[PDB]
Amino acid sequence: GIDAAQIVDEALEQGITLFVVNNRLQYETSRDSIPTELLNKWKQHKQELIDFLNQLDSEEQTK
Numbered sequence: 001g002i003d004a005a006q007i008v009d010e011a012l013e014q015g016i017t018l019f020v021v022n023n024r025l026q027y028e029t030s031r032d033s034i035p036t037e038l039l040n041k042w043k044q045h046k047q048e049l050i051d052f053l054n055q056l057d058s059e060e061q062t063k
Helices: 004-013 036-043 046-057
Strands: 016-021 025-027
Touching: 004 016, 004 036, 004 046, 016 046, 025 046, 036 046
Parallel strands: none
Antiparallel strands: 016 025
């Protein structure tokens, strides 16, 4: 399977901050030539990441 935490760790290493705004997966980074392989991964497990970022700050949106 895939670990939302694992995706956020690798993303941060490249300088990419993951988070959810209004139940929407969004990221903020300053640079160019982003890792497409990682980009698609975000959308691939969007729902998986959202639940992670949501329960990471809210820890009350369990499913």
